[PDB]
Design a protein around this ligand. Structure first.
Ligand SMILES: [Mn+2]
Ligand SMILES: [Mn+2]
Lengths: 261, 261
DNA sequence: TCGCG
DNA sequence: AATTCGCG
DNA sequence: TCGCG
DNA sequence: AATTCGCG
């Protein structure tokens, strides 16, 4: 849209970049916009880093590790800035998940199910895995006021509108987006506390209850509601939106070099 | 141990109760100890309940639901008390997870792996599912100061000490508890912020950072380190320990009926 | 190799 | 990765 | 039946 | 449920 990020976007659409390769393009574009700031991209972050990050908040936290070389590699990597104190502040982390062959299966006439008679396939629950990494990066950033975690969904198990796929013998299949036989979207809505789905939830909500005030860290959860695949341009533009917001909340610690380099 | 909870314990060991049936025995024993209080046990709690619970903290929270009849059934159920305001306060919620056939496979001479040559089986990552329900019940209790979630682990993928299993041709297998080829324990340590494993982490830690003070909700994560199965008595005694702590933190709202009934 | 996915 | 199916 | 596991 | 295996 805004000028130069339109060229980058068309570039992503032109090659159908996976989320990893788009995440690097966000590093690219960001560095064209903020040439005073220093961005790094990495494909891993490891439990020692998280642990020490935790310990720096409380001396009783982050004291565990069973497999020494333990890491987590979000399939979208991690983008970072260096702040005015040389520390590195994570601007983005993204992951991509698939679930629900149903549209392809219907499209090709292949009937599924134990006895080969099922038009649809009883939705499984693997997508609950997505919660661990979210817990990790949310712990990693337990001292930040922003949580730039974007999870990208697609597949028949994540429909947000009602679609009818037509199997080879001319027959259509009414696919009811709100069926528990299909839709697994609710398996994720714990991550952003039941706030909007396709939405920038990067800046943390500071809710309260008693004297007990608390901070909330909400993963931004995006979907391709029509069951189709993601436009590499749109994926990029979202990721750019999240990361700029991430920088906006970090602006206290990015003033000096942005105004003196 | 303490008198009557020893009889209940021997009862659980005598029939090798699954965690569900033990969770009901905790309701049993608790009601023998607190006959003024009113305990309920249920096998489900549903997303509408969670959502409304969320909304009662912030009018922007808990506004999502795709499959109407959406529930979550922790395999250990939910135990509750009625407080002085007729409201129900969850005293316990427990789940049981398995991973790692390796000990049984070695024990029976069955070599695994794509080409039938592997003594061990490359550990998979399904146990990351455990994080969703934890996020759910942690959201459900976002207004409490206690989080009585107990997760029970067992299997070769959750060893905490070093064990050697002996395959039928007299051969032993050194099983290295800290191998990433085996141990998946680190896949869970995000849930209790890297605090102790076999430990009552029910009372919430109130850590801080800036002016921003925050509350933490740590699942209590127990293991059978030697790869063996759980003693139904020990499972029960832990669950009892957690729930009594849960009551201790609830004692403001349990005074009147405990002293007037 | 280890370990994440 | 992310699936297939079982249980109510 | 729907939906969780 | 919770698995098998692929990728570095
Ligand atoms: Mn992925
Ligand atoms: Mn279970």
């Amino acid at each position: 849209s805004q000028g130069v990020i339109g060229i980058f976007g068309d570039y992503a659409k032109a090659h159908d970049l996976a989320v990893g390769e788009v995440s690097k393009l966000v590093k690219k574009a960001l560095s064209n916009e903020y040439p005073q700031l220093s961005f790094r991209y990495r494909d891993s972050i490891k439990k020692t880093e998280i642990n020490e990050a935790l310990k720096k908040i409380d001396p009783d936290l982050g004291g565990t590790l069973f497999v020494s070389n333990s890491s987590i590699k979000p399939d979208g990597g991690i983008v970072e800035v260096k702040d005015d104190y040389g520390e590195w502040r994570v601007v983005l982390v993204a992951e991509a998940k698939h679930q629900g062959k149903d549209i392809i299966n219907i499209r090709n006439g292949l009937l599924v199910g134990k006895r080969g008679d099922q038009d649809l396939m009883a939705a499984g629950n693997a997508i609950e895995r997505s919660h661990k990494n979210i817990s990790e990066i949310a712990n990693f950033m337990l001292s930040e006021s922003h949580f730039p975690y974007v999870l990208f969904l697609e597949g028949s198990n994540f429909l947000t509108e009602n679609i009818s796929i037509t199997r080879p013998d001319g027959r259509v299949v009414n696919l009811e987006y709100n069926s528990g036989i299909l839709n697994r979207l609710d398996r994720l809505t714990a991550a952003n506390y039941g706030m909007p789905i396709n939405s920038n939830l990067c800046i943390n909500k500071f809710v309260n209850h008693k004297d007990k005030s608390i901070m909330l860290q909400a993963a931004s959860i995006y979907t391709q509601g029509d069951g189709r695949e993601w436009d590499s341009k749109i994926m990029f533009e979202i990721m750019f939106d999240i990361s700029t917001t991430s920088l906006r909340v970090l602006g206290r610690d990015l003033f000096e070099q942005l105004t003196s380099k």
